[PDB]
Each structure stands twice: as C-alpha cells, then as structure tokens.
Amino acid sequence: TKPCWYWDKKDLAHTPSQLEGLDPATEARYRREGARFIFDVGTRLGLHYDTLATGIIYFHRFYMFHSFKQFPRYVTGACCLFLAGKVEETPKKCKDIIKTARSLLNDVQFGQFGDDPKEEVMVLERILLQTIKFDLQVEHPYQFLLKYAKQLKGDKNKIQKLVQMAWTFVNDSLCTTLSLQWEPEIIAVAVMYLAGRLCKFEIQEWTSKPMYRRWWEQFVQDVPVDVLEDICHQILDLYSQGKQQMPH
Amino acid sequence: TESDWGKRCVDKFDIIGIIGEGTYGQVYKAKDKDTGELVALKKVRLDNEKEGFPITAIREIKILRQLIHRSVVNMKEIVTDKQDALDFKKDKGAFYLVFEYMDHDLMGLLESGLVHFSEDHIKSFMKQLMEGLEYCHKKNFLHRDIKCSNILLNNSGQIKLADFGLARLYNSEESRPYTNKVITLWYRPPELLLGEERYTPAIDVWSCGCILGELFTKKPIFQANLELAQLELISRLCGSPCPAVWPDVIRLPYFNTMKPKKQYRRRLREEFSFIPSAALDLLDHMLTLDPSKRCTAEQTLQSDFLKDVELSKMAPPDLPHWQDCH
Amino acid sequence: MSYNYVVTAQKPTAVNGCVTGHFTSAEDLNLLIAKNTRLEIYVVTAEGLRPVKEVGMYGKIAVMELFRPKGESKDLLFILTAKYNACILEYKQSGESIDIITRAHGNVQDRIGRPSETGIIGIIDPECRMIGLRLYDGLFKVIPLDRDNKELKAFNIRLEELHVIDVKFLYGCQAPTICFVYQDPQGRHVKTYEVSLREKEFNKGPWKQENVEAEASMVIAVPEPFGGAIIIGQESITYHNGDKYLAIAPPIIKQSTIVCHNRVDPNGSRYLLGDMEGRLFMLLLEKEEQMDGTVTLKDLRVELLGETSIAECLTYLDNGVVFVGSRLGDSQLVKLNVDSNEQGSYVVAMETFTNLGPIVDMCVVDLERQGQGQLVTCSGAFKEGSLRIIRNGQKLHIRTVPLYESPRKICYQEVSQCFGVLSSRIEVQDTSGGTTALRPSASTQALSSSVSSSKLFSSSTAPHETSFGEEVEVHNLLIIDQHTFEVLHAHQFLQNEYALSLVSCKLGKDPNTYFIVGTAMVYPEEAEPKQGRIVVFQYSDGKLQTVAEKEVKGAVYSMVEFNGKLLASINSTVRLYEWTTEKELRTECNHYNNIMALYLKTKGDFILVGDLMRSVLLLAYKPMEGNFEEIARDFNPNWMSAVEILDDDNFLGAENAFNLFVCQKDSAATTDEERQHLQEVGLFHLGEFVNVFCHGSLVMQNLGETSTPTQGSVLFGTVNGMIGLVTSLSESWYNLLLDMQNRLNKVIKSVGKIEHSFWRSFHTERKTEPATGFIDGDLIESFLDISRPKMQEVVANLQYDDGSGMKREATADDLIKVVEELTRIH
C-alpha cells in the first residue's frame, strides 16, 4: 500500500554517500546546506512554510537512495522545491527558482547547475518522482504543534512563548535527519517538550489531565521519553556546534 | 513491494484501445498480463517540459492515494515507458496512472439515449455519488469538475467519481483565493458565475443537483454557451439572485454587472412537478442560490429520498444490450 | 472540413397517419395522408381518390387533426412536428392556384420535461375550444383555440398520473372532459378530468376511476347518443360511461393485438378495429331505447370482416371504401361488402399503393448488364415482407416479390445467378410441443429445403420452458433466382438461432464462391447472446451444402469480405479469419475495445466499426505484423444505426435520432492525440432512420457523359421507405450551393412557417446543433419550382468563387442549368 519512510540512526552509516567515501560529518554538512538552500530560496520567493518543509523532506529522502557525489545538492534542492510547489499548490516557475538560486549562490556553487540550469533541474524531476515513489503527501510537525497547543489552556503568554520556541525548533530540525527517523507527530511533541524544559514550564498543568505527568501520551501514544530526549539532544547539538544559542 | 511506484514498466499491460482523450494525456483500456485485470491507463507526458510534470496529474496522484471509498476511483499504481538505460537526461518516456476500468460513463449512457432510470435506480445512483462526495468533503477536498462525464458507472450499478484533476483542499478557518472558472458551465454554481473566487464545498453540491434533475429528464437543466445566458437560465428556474434570498450577493464581483432580464420568482417546484416529492425537495435544497443555505452532502444522505436506500440492493440502470440492433 | 450533398431519390412511402374531413371545401370529402415530412391531400370519389395537392413540411408530422371552429366554413388542420413545431393550416384555392395558409404557429417545447413513453398525443375538443397535448410525463398542455392566439401560446396543468397510455376528449359532456388510461404500480385505470380554461387547472370529472385490463391500449370517444368511451385491450373491449359498464372478451381478438380504430357510423353504432396480423374487425354498438326516450348501450359485438395489410391507420371514407394506411406493407383501398364471398370474407381489395416498407437491407446489382444498376431491397415485415427491384425509367419502376415473411439481409452471388436472403417467420407454440406457422411463406414454399443438423450447442442442459400460444422466430437462408425470383432453396437454422449477417464471397485460395451466414443463439433469459455460429454454405446444383461451421462466443452482428479473409464482429470483438486449405476458418487477429460491434465496413486495409453507443472507430489491418491498429475514434457519443466509408479520410454515420454525420481524420499530424481524434465535420438532420448504406447509383451511366459537380454515390434505405443519396462536393461548389440555400430560405415560404435552418439542425433530446457540411439537395432542387420573380430575387448579388473567374455573377437562367444537372444524379 504505502512506503516506509523511516530509518534507524544506525542505518545512516550506510547511505550511498557514506559508501562512496563521504564521511559522516560531510554528509551532515551537505544535508544542512541543501536544506537551508531550499529554505532560503523559497523564503525569498514568498513560499508557505509547508512548501519549504515538503521540498526539504523530498531532499532528505532523495539522498537515502543516491550519493551526493553523483547528484549535486543544490540542483536536487531546487528540483525538490520546484516539485514541492506543485504538490502543495504554491507553484513557481522553474526559471524563477533558478533566478533566486543564482542570487543566493556564489559562482562556484552555481557551477553545479552546469551550462543550462533550468534543464538540469527539470530533467531531475523524473528521478525525484521515482525516488520518492510518487508518495507526494507529507505531514509536518507544524500542524501537530498547533493541533496539540490548541488543547492547552492557561496563561496565554506562556503557551505562546512555548509555541514560538517550539516552532523555531521545528524549522531547525529540517536541517537534520530527524525527518527520516521519527514521524512528524513525535517531532512536534519533542519540540514542545524541549521548549518546556528551557522555559521551566510544566505542560501537564495546561492539559485536561493535569496530574498525568507524561502529558504527551494523550497526543502521541507509545512514545518513550528516550525518543523525545534523543530528538532534543540532536536539536540542541546543532546550536552547540554552531555559534547560535537557544532562542529563549 | 506494492508501494514502489514509478518503476514497473507498461510492458505489463496489453493495451486494448484508447477509451478517451484526457487533459494531460490520452486514456487507454488495458489488461494486466499477470492477473487479467482490465485497467485504465492515463498517459502523463512530461516531454512538453514547459513546466514539468503536470499539476493536474500531481493533484490526482496526491489526492487519490489518500481517498479510499467505494464511490471514489482507485489509482492502483504508476508505471513507465521503457526508460533509457543510464541516460536520465535523454529519457523522455511517459508515465501512466493505472486506474480500475469502468464499463461506462454517465454522459455516454445518457447521450446515446440507451438508459432509463426509475426512481429506485436514481436513489441507488445518487446515494453512492453523494456518499463519495461526503467522503471527499469530510476530508476537506473539493472536486470542482463534477460533470456527467466524470461520474463513472459499472454495469453492476456501482458509481465511482473519477477526474480529480482540479481538486484542492478547502479550509473553513483560512479563506483562500481560488480559480473562478472551475466547473463546466452547464454544472457551474451561480456563486462562481458571479466570480466568488473564495468558494465553498457547496459548489460540488450544485453540480450534483443539476445531475439529479437531469436523471429525471434525461436532459441537462441549464444548457448555455455563455456565462450570462447561464445565469439567465438558472434565474428563470431558481429565481434571480437578490439580497432577499442571498444576503451576501452584493459582495460578489459581478452581481451588479450580470443582471438577468427580470427579477424572476422561483418556479423550481412548478417546472419539476413531475418529479417525486422526496426528490423535488432534495432538488430544491441542492439548487439553492445562496451557498451558505445550500444543503451539504451529509444533509442529502439524511433526506427522505436517500436515507432509507439500502445500498446492498444495488439496482443497476436499465441498459439494453440486445434488440437495440433492430 | 468536409462538403457533402444529400438528395431524396424516393420520398417516404409508409403511412404515418390519415384523417377524413372537409378541408379543401366545406362541400368535398377529403382524405389527408401523412407520410414522414409529407402531407398528401385527396378528394373522395365513387371510384377512388382524386389527388389535389401535396406539400412538404420541415418536420416529421406527429399530430395531424382536422377541426372546424364556430365561424369557419370548412375544416382547419393542426399539425405538430416531432420537434414541437405547431401550426394551424388552411386550404385556399384561386382558380388554378392552390396554396396552403399558415393561420397560427409556434414552438411548444418546454425547457423542462420528460418525454413520454407512448409518445406525443394530440386531441381536440368536440366544441373546438382547445387543443390538448400530452408531450411530457406528469403534464397536460392546453392551447386554447381563441381567435387571438395566433402564436399558439399555451399553459401546462399539473397531472398527478405520470404514466398515461392514451387520452381523448370525450363527447357528450357539459364542459371539456378528458378520458385517459394510465398506469401506476396497482395496474391500469381509466379516469376522467374536466379542463377549465378560466381557472387553468383540472376539476373533478364526470365518472369515477375504474380499473381496466393490464394491457389497455386505446381510448375511443363514443359520440352521442351513447357518450362515454370504449377501451380496447389485448383480451377485452370495455365500455365505460358513469354507472354503466360493459365488457366483451371474444376469443378471436386475443390472438392478435389490436392497434388501430376508426369510426364508421357518425352516431357511433359501428367502429373498425385492426390487428397486427392484418385482420379487420367490425365493432358494433347494439342500441336499446328505454321508454324515457333515451338510448342506452345494450351490448357490444365483434365481427370478423376479413384481411387487409397490417395497418397503422384506418379511415372509413364513404360507402364501403376503407383506406388501409400501412407502415409495414402496401397501403390499400378496400371495399366492405354486405354479402360475404365464397371464402367467408367481406373485404375485397380495390387498389394497392406501393410502400417500400421498412428497408432492412439492400444491394445494388446490374441484373441486365446495362451498366446502370438495380436496387434490390429487403422491404416490409411479417405477412407484408417482400423484395423490391427498383430501377430508373420520369418515375421509378418497381417490381414486388412477395415473401409473406420478414426479410432481414440480402446479398448477390453472380456466379450462381441468384440472391441469398435471410428471413424470419413467426410460428406459435402448439399443442404438439412444437410450433405451427400462421401462414405459408417463402421459407416453406421453397423448391428444395434443408435444416441445420449442427451439434455445436446440442449439449444444452440449459432449460427453456415453452407455453402454448407464445411466438417464436424461425430463421432461414433463402436462395432466390435473379430472373424469376423463385425461391429455389430454403435452409432453416437451429431452434432459437437468429441469422444476423450474410456475405457472398471467395476466400483464400479456394475457387468456390460461398454464402456465409453469421448467427446468434437467442434465449429470452439472456441480456446479450453468448453463443453463435459462422456457417459456410455452398449453393451448387440446386442444393445448399454446409461446408464448414465455426463456433463463436457471441452474436455475429456483421461480416464483410476482407482481402480474401473473413472479417466478422462478435459482440465487442472484431475478428479477422483466414480460410485454410482444409476449408476451415482460422483466427488471425482480434480487436476488443468496443462496447458492441454492430456494423462493419472496409476499404483497402482500413476497417470502419460502428458501435452501439461509442459512434465510429477507424481500424487498420497491418499485414507486416498480422494484427489490427486503432487509427482514430469519434469520441463524441452517438447511437449508430448504419455506417459507410465515403473515401480514405471521410466517414459517414447515421444516428438513432434520425441524424447524419461525417467524421474525418484530423490530418494535422503534429501529435498522436490529434491523429487519433476523428472530428465530426458534417452534421445533418435527415428525418429518417437509415438502416442500410450502399455504394452505387441507379442512373443509366453506360455510353453517357455522366459528368456532374458531385463526386461519389452512396444510396441509403430507411424505415419509412425513403431512399436517399449522399455525394461529395468541392469547396467551391459547396459554398455556391450553401450561399444559395440561405438565399432560397428567405424567398421560399414554409408550411407552418418553420425555419429551414431549425429543421436540419442536428437534434437529440440532449443537443441541438446547426447543420454543417451538408447541402439540402431537396432545397436546391426546389429552385426549379419557384416562380420567375423569386428566381431572380434569389440570384441577386450572388458571386461564384475559385472558378476560372474569381468573382462571377449568377443569373436566373445560369442557376436553372446548374440545378438541372444536379437533378440528373437522383
């Protein structure tokens, strides 16, 4: 019926990129750069946050089946965003994505697009569609962050602070392989959980079950804290590796 | 696995013939060589490459893999032409959307004049269509091209909706700009004739009501060539749009522009007096001018006409297959 | 685009309706006969009929009735066409000049309505106060006959009874009263309502509803003295008037359904009844006078008079002369005698009027080697079945060959100097367990005879029960001599086997010429036949030999010889068979994307397939591969009645809506999709049902110039006996004739003021399109009949094109020559 789109962390040691001699740090870097390229290009074009995320999810899934050494990442990214726009009904012309990609990329980086940028992108759409197995519908943590937050009642300002901080964590998680490890529902919980710790909030008080200390179980069944902590650790790792700090 | 779409080749289907001409490619009848199942193949050609894979096909793939109902057509898989070996750039082969084969389309049965619907036949037909539309509406999808051609009928009497190339999600919370010219003029709601641009799911209900009346007359109800003439025909039957019956008509772009010849009174019950009472009440509610007063798909299924219809008793249309020669 | 021309070679001959009245003068007795689109006016004499006038109407005549409103000296005529064109007509004569006046006219079509099963019914009040029309289920339309209603404006009254069988205005009622038989789930009932022009609704009628026979078919309005109505069924005749109810159920009428009725005595004492087997009855109203001075209906009696042609309409005229208006056989004048003849009959035929009847099939054959061609038709039905030999000589000369059974298909076999004809006759289950024929016929009067002994379906084990009295069809292949038309041989097919298709041809390397028949096993239980045969016969030395049989899983609706191979259509499948050196059929290739392959035509390696609902598909045989390929399909949906190939690119079809269309290959080969789309370039409303299309012409072409603007010749036969011809034009010639039509339509006065453009518009219950690609040759040929002032008015400002001269003005005398050349092809 439907394909399985989730791998174990341990499985990422065996992507085509890894097996062609790319080390884990380099592939992680390529994923961040490609995702952020997608994010930045589409933001300049005024695209909805779901459209950006969908392109990024296509991008991440693509490089579970292909190597970064044989598919230049910024061409793939542009193609993913191009298809994402049509899937999410926020369409853009391929020439406009190229125009924006050229504005944001230096001369070396835009070299990936070769002599005919539009052609390199349009040609890839065939491989992208076959790679993602024509499973175009994608759900993102954003809708669950809001669906679950709507069921919290209490101080308007503390919950809004929780949501925005969690929302930022969602945007930052698109640069990682969490999209490939955990369903979006879990991601939304993990970011609510992380924002709660950083804000010293006790979310259970805002739920309909204020004495149920594992507040998330009423939103996402069968999620151990271990999973939420692993997600939290990976998100904060991005901040620690960079110069950026938690939004708070 | 069954889910790894886009890889299996079209070699696996013996192509019987070309059933129809599509929007993004022609539609073919075929038989799976392995199972003997008759299937319908929609050819998607991305070789035009003006803007890549057609969005019309993307919508149908995206939505129909989500929708599972007896009255919604099933996309079984997507198959490809023999691909160029290790030359993805030169590969211009097309993709095929595999659908379940449907014996007939409503337009064909009606236009040939080869079918007669009794009240019981219409009950079974409308219940399946409106249940299917409700499934789509509960999932917040708008068909936007409901026409006799898109309704597909198997000889058993099972009805399935088909062409979702114009379908888009509807948000009640967030009103969104939509395309004004969506449905064929004959089945187009009055709100869209005046250019709503932010339309409700009630657009599909209007179209199904036009079909309901047609099943009792064997002739479409509102046949016009131009948008103004269409508003005139609707007005002659349903009454002219006016704040008395549609308070927000004054907000619509073309209300003052597209005035009908007169401010007509509603005669729907008079001209359709030959229709059974339960149906006439259903038609009167479905063909309501104001989309916020027009009934829903669910409300049609909780009507005296369709509520007690047992779907087990399929009741097929009366289609002659012999003595039609002479 | 394509350009084509259609002319009538023989006008419709079947009688659709007949009325008697005082239409031409208040003094004469007239008989108005309505053949499809044609009105014939006669005056009754002591010997027969004197013709006085004939007009054509731009519409099929559906209702034809004569009424005389107070203040008129003579009867007026109401005609309603099948496209709902209504009009009131008056006869006016000025010395030698006869013309028809349109007194009132309009179109009474409703935007919303369901056309009724029993068709359009039109009736007029005895006081001529209103015209009643039953056009749609659940509605009764009233045209009030006031002096001011020159546009025939009308209103609808809601009618609770949705399924009406028949309705007639009743005599002897205080106010306008309708009597109608209707059907609801509880059976059939007779009910009366009153019609109020002032209130524009029904009021309760004079007498109560009564349940009537389940197959109650016709309503008779009995004039005063009796009043009330008589209801004719399958088994019984009943009289209803208030409290009085009578019923006679004589066993003689149960045998055959009664379809027509006419009044003999104005007082209502005697009526004529006719049935489907051609019998003519007298229905007698036996009067009883009470001491009050009132006359009551005492009893009803039915008396068999004799036999006529299977009659659609009956008209008593005067004296003993009855006009038998027939649609399935020749019409007649017959005289009813008081004394029976020595055989027991009171009916003796006077005159016989040729009716080509339903033309089921036909072929063109040069019987005398004249380089001309003769048209041999399968005409008529049941006891009226016949073959008709038709040749040009200025009138058509027609020989009739009676068969007394229904002819189905005909094909000519020159090698054998004979015709092969498929026929069916009706037998009835009898007390022996077998069946008995109602009369001897061609298949039983053959010189030599044979019966299939095929064992193909003999395994049966499928039960089909028989009840005494039920009808069955018995199918035969007749071998008929081309000179004497003697039935030399008759081959009877299996029980319940229908013969559907017939060809005469040689196959493969076999030098023998065979008759090949495609059949279907027809059982009442089946929605669609699932068994059938292709049978190869050889006619040699006065005997028909079964050469080979091929079993198929369906009905062989159509067959045609294809380059030494046999092309046959079995249900959806289109199959090509080869004829082996072992004299057996072997399948080469099949095509399956069809709903039902009713019709097949070929040209070269190209095949045209006509589907029940999917219009026409152009297929090609690809010899390199040994299979078929779909060239293009007409994706517009049409119900086909016949098909024909005009040339390699243009294809002709006939729709069950009495419409004609031509499809062409798109010839804009930039995309595969465009090539596979056959585009309907020509649309035309013929007004006739085309059963058969045949290439050929009946004009004498040998040792002749035989030069005409027109190219090609397709003849076609129709249900109403009409024979027409379709021929091709150049773009230049089309434009000239089309521009001329538009000029002629402004000049020529139409009966009923019906717009010609409307009449020829492609019309189904769901669509109406303007005609395209077709020139109405019958309009063009009328230029020669309009007066000189009108001719010169037509040619004013008319220019020719693409000729030697780019623009060339036309004169009246120039066009007279052109049209006369066009009259030479028909």
Ligand SMILES: CC[C@H](CO)Nc1nc(NCc2ccc3ccccc3c2)c2ncn(C(C)C)c2n1
């Ligand atoms: C989408 C446009 C088409 C044509 O109107 N619609 C369409 N028609 C289907 N079958 C009816 C049909 C129509 C035409 C025929 C012609 C010849 C022989 C058989 C024919 C059968 C069908 N089956 C399955 N699909 C899927 C694609 C949903 C279909 N889509």
